[PDB]
Amino acid sequence: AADYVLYKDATKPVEDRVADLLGRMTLAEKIGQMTQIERLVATPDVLRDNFIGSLLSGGGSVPRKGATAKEWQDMVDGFQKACMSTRLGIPMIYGIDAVHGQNNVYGATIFPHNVGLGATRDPYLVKRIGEATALEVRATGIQYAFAPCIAVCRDPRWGRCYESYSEDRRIVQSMTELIPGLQGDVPKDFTSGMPFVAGKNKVAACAKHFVGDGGTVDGINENNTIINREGLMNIHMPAYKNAMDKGVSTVMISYSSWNGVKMHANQDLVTGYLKDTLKFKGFVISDWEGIDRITTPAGSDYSYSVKASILAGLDMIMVPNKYQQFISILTGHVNGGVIPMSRIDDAVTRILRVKFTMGLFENPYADPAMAEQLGKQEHRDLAREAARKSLVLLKNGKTSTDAPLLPLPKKAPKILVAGSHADNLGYQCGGWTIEHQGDTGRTTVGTTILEAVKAAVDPSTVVVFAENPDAEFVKSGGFSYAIVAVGEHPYTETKGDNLNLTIPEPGLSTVQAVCGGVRCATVLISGRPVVVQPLLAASDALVAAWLPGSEGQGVTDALFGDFGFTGRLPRTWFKSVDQLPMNVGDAHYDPLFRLGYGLTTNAT
Ligand SMILES: *[C]O[C@@]1(*)[C](S[C]2O[C]([C][O])[C]([O])[C]([O])[C]2[O])[C]([O])[C]([O])[C]([C][O])O1*
Ligand SMILES: *[C@@H]1O[C@H](CO)[C@@H](O)[C@H](O)[C@H]1NC(C)=O
Ligand SMILES: *[C@@H]1O[C@H](CO)[C@@H](O)[C@H](O)[C@H]1NC(C)=O
């Protein structure tokens, strides 16, 4: 008709649609696009009245505990219906931390955390995990995952070291294959730095957190990274360029500083480097209250937080709560000439560019036929393959002349499974699982190590579980062997920062009691290397299983010799925390186990 609106026409080029919509928008509509809010503060009126551009779920932000995929779809669609009811009908994009599967969601497949994936040296595996993750995210109606974390963790004292594929940038680079898994492969023609998402069965990705988040002093989370530009560019930056080449749709800025300059206020790096040198054309998003934390104390000059961040080049702000204040302050700054319209128009161009590119104007609503992708057995099979491939065998015999303990026989009259982490699904998933910090016990659908043992063994094999047996119990039990699992409790972000890296008790005391009685395979669950000499000294065999996720049969696949051990350390294992930071090229490089170490077995 003469009711045609070019931006609404799916046959037009993305840039023509962006320009056409931009040209129609009020300042309020523009600033609304730049605002991302928590679902916890969203209502239909809020979304409509403030022209909100995006919503998220922070860790543990769920419609309710145990919600079905359809409950999530219906929640997301309710918010979208409100956004579509605005004058311009701009759909919101909904983001979430799907960082090892769609991990906030009950019944979602939970993949190994990134450090384990590093150990696989299998970028195609990681791609396929991207692919599966996209499907389980879209099962829930969600279009945007805040992944991959391409931090290069340089000090394992950092509470997010498990979110880093490796201390070696080349491994992190190789695992940027998660991006085309989540988003789809970019076409032959593609210009590096353009955003890309294939369509409604894929999700927008997010390379995070730009830049040097894994380089902070003593691994303190959100702190300062002191390194010259050459080291920044040589360690922390390279994977951002691989992300551009694969069309990552968004980049999230780090809470960390670089030589004292807050990333969230760093115009030279965000605009000068990311946008102007790497030619990034997607949208730059803040971290959660990232702009607030520009100042000390945080939140003490919000006016300045908004100015500094938007002038630095950020496009979308993860507020995520005080949207009225954010919108009011940015409006005032624009009205006062402090922030030019050209900056607003750039941020909104980028946001709209991602939304049009990914098909969000053509498919703003969830597909109910996708709900059944959640926790699909094919995806669990993949997680089980990844878990097994992630495992790094550190010891398999106390002496060079002992019979190797692994692989264990599936037939034996009686076996012991022991330890705090042998039958605890939450602990084997770690942080960013159901809750932000993760949790203990049977928090979702999966298979614990105990469950996996019982599923694996010959029917004549009696399996005895004892969480923390004493030495006499073990000696008296008539056991052929034991599998004993211990390690770190779940943690996320600052809560995981840890200067001593010794596992909690009872962990070591149980290993000692078990292994003193019967030959034992110790399965160490951790997000990083931890003090391990005492555990090694006690154990016949020891496996670094990292945080292998929901599919504990990946552990038993290698214990019982269905597959051989192939994992190799993607990080240095230190002798002592007083050595840290210590990386695979220093000077005082005196590792317990060097990067790349890993014993192997053959399938039986
Ligand atoms: C769940 O947010 C936490 C933040 S951290 C922040 O969260 C965003 C969104 O979940 C992630 O994508 C990002 O990788 C991460 O750095 C803490 O710093 C907050 O203090 C906490 C308070 O509720 O929430
Ligand atoms: C680093 O942490 C110290 C100690 O908590 C804190 O006082 C300082 O502000 C932090 N620095 C940065 C840049 O975040
Ligand atoms: C495993 O296979 C390799 C190569 O074929 C061989 O050299 C090694 O001795 C094998 N180990 C065992 C226990 O069979």
Q: What single-letter amino acid sits at 128?
A: R
Q: Which helix (H) or strand (E) holds 378?
A: helix 377-390
Q: How many angstroms does the Cα of residue 222 sit away from the middle of ligand 2?
A: 8
Experimental method: X-ray
Q: Tokens 């084997």: give the residue.
A: 428
Ligand 2 pocket check for 257: Cβ under 6 Å: yes
Domain-located, residue 82: yes
Same domain, 30 and 126: yes
**Dihedral sign from CA coordinates of 431, 97, 286, 76:** negative
Tell me phi and psi for residue 12, to 5 degrees: -85, 155
Residue 397 is assigned to a structural domain of this protein:
yes
Atom of ligand 1 nearest to the CA of 61: 1
> What letter represents residue 9's amino acid?
D
Positive or negative: CA dihedral 44, 50, 52, 55: negative
CA 41 to ligand 2 centroid distance, Å: 30
Phi and psi of 36, rounded to 5°? Answer: -110, 130
Who's near 586: CB < 8 A, 6+ residues apart?
A: none
DSSP string, 103-147: TTSTT---PPPHHHHHHHT-HHHHHHHHHHHHHHHHHTT--EE--
CB of 208 closer than 6 A to ligand 1? yes
CB distance 493 to ligand 1 below 6 Å: yes
Running DSSP on this structure, what letter comes out for residue 566? -
Cα–Cα distance measured from residue 26 to residue 49, given in angstroms and rounded to the nearest whole number? 13
Rounded CA separation 11/21 (Å): 15
Q: Is 97 a catalytic residue?
A: no
Domain ends where: 327, 354, 375? 375
Distance 602 CA to ligand 3 centre (A): 6
Identity of the residue numbered 590: D
Mutate to test the pocket of ligand 1, among 55, 256, 288 (most ligand atoms within 8 A of CB): 288
This structure's resolution (angstroms)? 1.9
Strands (E), 58-117: 93-96
For the chain, what is the radius of gyration of the CA atoms? 25
Between vectors from CA 104 to CA 375 and to CA 159, what angle results, nearest 5°? Answer: 120
**One-character DSSP codes across 528-565:** S----HHHHHH-SEEEEEE---SBTHHHHHHHTTSS--
Same domain for 383 and 319: no
**Could you tell me if 175 and 97 lie in one domain?**
yes
Nearest-angstrom CA–CA distance, 462 and 454: 9
Are 68 and 205 within one domain?
yes
Burial of 120 (0-12, 13-18, 19+ CB in 10 A): buried
Judgement on whether residues 263 and 161 belong to the same structural domain of the protein: yes
Characterize the bridge pairing of strands 257-258 and 261-262: antiparallel
Same-domain pairing of 241 and 121:
yes
287 part of the active site: yes
Together in a domain, 466 and 362: no
The sign of the CA dihedral 41, 44, 46, 47 is positive
Residues 382 and 516 in one domain: yes
Q: Are residues 429 and 478 in the same domain?
A: yes
Check if 146 has its Cβ closer than 6 Å to any atom of ligand 1: yes
- Inter-residue long-range contacts of 86-90, CB under 8 Å, 24+ positions, other chains counted: 86/29, 86/47, 86/48, 86/51, 87/29, 88/21, 88/24, 88/25, 88/29, 88/51, 89/8, 90/21, 90/29, 90/33, 90/51, 90/53, 90/352, 90/355
- State the Cα–Cα distance between residues 215 and 257, nearest whole angstrom: 10
User: Residue 436 and residue 430: Cα distance in Å, rounded?
Assistant: 10
The token pair at 511 is: 């290993």
C-beta neighbour count of 478 within 10 angstroms: 11
Last residue of a domain, one of 540, 561, 582: 561
CB of 97 sitting under 6 A from ligand 1? yes
- Indicate the burial class of 11 (C-beta count within 10 angstroms; 0-12, 13-18, 19 or more): exposed
Residues 323 and 400 in one domain: no
Q: 431 alpha carbon to ligand 1 midpoint, in Å?
A: 12
Contact 330, 310 (CB under 8 A): yes
Q: Which residues pair with 76 in a beta bridge?
A: none
203 is a domain residue: yes
- Whether residue 582 lies inside any domain: the answer is no
Query: Which of 342, 357, 375 is the last residue in one of the domains?
Result: 375
- Is 573 contained in some domain? no
Domain-embedded: residue 579? no
Q: In the structure encoding, which two tokens stand for residue 561, read together?
A: 């010799």
How many angstroms does the Cα of residue 223 sit away from the middle of ligand 2? Answer: 5
In terms of domains, do 294 and 436 share one?
Answer: no
Residues whose CB falls within 8 Å of the CB of residue 319, separated by 6 or more in sequence, listed in order: 35, 36, 37, 38, 289, 326
Q: Based on the structure, what is the number of domains in the chain? A: 2
Q: What pairs with residue 487 in β-bridges?
A: 525
Domain hosting residue 146, numbered range = 1-375
Is residue 477, in this structure, part of any structural domain at all? yes
List b or e across 344-376, with b for residues whose CB sees 16 or more CB atoms inside 10 angstroms. bebbbbbbbbbbbbbbbbeebebeeebbebbbb
Q: Is residue 229 part of a domain?
A: yes
What is the Cα–Cα distance from 289 to 306, expressed in whole angstroms?
Answer: 11
Q: Tokens 């922070």 label which residue?
A: 58
Q: At what angle do helices 123-139 and 377-390 cross, to 10 degrees?
A: 140
Atom 11 in ligand 2: residue holding the nearest Cα: 223
Give the strand order in the sheet containing 261-262: 224-225, 257-258, 261-262
The answer on 421 and 359 residing in a single domain is: no
